[PDB]
Write a protein that binds this ligand. Structure first.
Ligand SMILES: NC(=O)c1ccc[n+]([C@@H]2O[C@H](COP(=O)([O-])OP(=O)(O)OC[C@H]3O[C@@H](n4cnc5c(N)ncnc54)[C@H](OP(=O)(O)O)[C@@H]3O)[C@@H](O)[C@H]2O)c1
Length: 315
């Protein structure tokens, strides 16, 4: 479509640049190059440790009159150690200052899981699992609502919430704003049609993260399945005279999901924008959907015992 529309009215660009694992000394040029290629949406997060450097690229493009702030759709996320209601405004302000922006277009609760506050991002105990705080994400949701009320963010949403977690927000007494977006892992090996269908029935947009399976994820050990080099999808690419990457990016788009592929490589940032020039015929769509192995790349195993760990539920 080019954009999907959130329930607030705001047009959210269907393709965005992902910045997880984009190193601080590469992400400014990547952001700059992307905006030069026409990307108008950047997905960021406090925990990626490069929002300052994202802010540099953006500032350059905005002072250089290459883009108007209204044309940009910048997303960031509230980290797990900042879920306590009193910590939320502070975390949104750090992110705003680092990004050098006055408001965010979308701010997401990054994971349902609140971790014990402190500077350490993943506070681990002696057994090695993560330490929980004393908060419920419904209380965090309320402080996220105050950010809308003050004009710090134009829309709020969640990420990696299962449908019962989304339900607990939707059914909250006093709910002022509902999640405009649920950003979740989606790719052939985790097609997520139940959660997607659910959010779509509730009028929540879906952003598919890790559209290519994340080759650069630290935990990639040699025996892993590589979506990009899986001969089956490379074959349907060959037919399309498109790459495995461009077709794995076209797939969520054809499902009416926002896609945010990550690349710091200029050439691949341009290739990933070169997806608006074709359609996959319905057999192809069915051929990729049938690869649902329910293979998660972002499982957060360290937090599997957490009361709000999202993935013990089916969807
Ligand atoms: N909410 C959440 O919990 C959450 C979790 C994970 C990810 N996300 C978001 O989703 C974004 C994308 O997911 P991801 O970074 O995990 O992985 P991804 O987009 O599936 O894959 C990124 C990897 O694939 C490579 N790649 C990108 N374009 C390519 C192309 N055109 N051809 C060949 N290889 C290509 C990248 O290499 P180079 O970068 O070296 O080019 C990088 O190694 C993240 O950056 C982040 O913003 C959100």
């Amino acid at each position: 479509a080019s954009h999907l529309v959130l329930y607030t009215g705001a047009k959210m660009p269907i393709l965005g640049l992902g910045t997880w694992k984009s190193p601080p000394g590469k992400v400014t040029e990547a952001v700059k190059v992307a905006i030069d290629l026409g990307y108008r949406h950047i997905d960021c997060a406090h925990v990626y440790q490069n929002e300052n450097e994202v802010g540099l690229g953006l500032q350059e493009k905005l002072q250089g009159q290459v883009v108007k702030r209204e044309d940009l759709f910048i997303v960031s996320k509230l980290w797990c150690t900042d879920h306590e209601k009193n910590l939320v405004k502070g975390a949104c302000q750090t992110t705003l200052r680092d990004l050098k922006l006055d408001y965010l277009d979308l701010y997401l609760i990054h994971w349902p899981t609140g971790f014990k506050p402190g500077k350490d991002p993943f506070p681990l105990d002696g057994d090695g699992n993560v330490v929980p705080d004393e908060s419920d994400f419904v209380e965090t949701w309320e402080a996220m609502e105050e950010l809308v009320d003050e004009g710090l963010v134009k829309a709020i949403g969640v990420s990696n919430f299962n449908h019962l977690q989304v339900e607990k927000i939707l059914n909250k007494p006093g709910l002022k704003y509902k999640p405009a977006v649920n950003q979740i892992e989606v790719h052939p090996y985790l097609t997520q049609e139940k959660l997607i269908e659910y959010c779509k029935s509730k009028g929540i947009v879906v952003t598919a993260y890790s559209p290519l399976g994340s080759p650069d994820r630290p935990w990639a050990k040699p025996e892993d399945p590589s979506l990009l080099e899986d001969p089956r999808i490379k074959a349907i690419a060959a037919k399309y005279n498109k790459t495995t990457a461009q077709v794995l990016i076209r797939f969520p788009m054809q499902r009416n999901l926002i896609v945010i592929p990550k690349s710091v490589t200029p050439e691949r940032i341009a290739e990933n924008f070169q997806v608006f020039d074709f359609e996959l015929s319905p057999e192809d769509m069915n051929t990729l959907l049938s690869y649902n192995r329910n293979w998660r790349v972002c499982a957060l195993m360290s937090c599997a015992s957490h009361k709000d760990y999202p993935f013990h539920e089916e969807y």
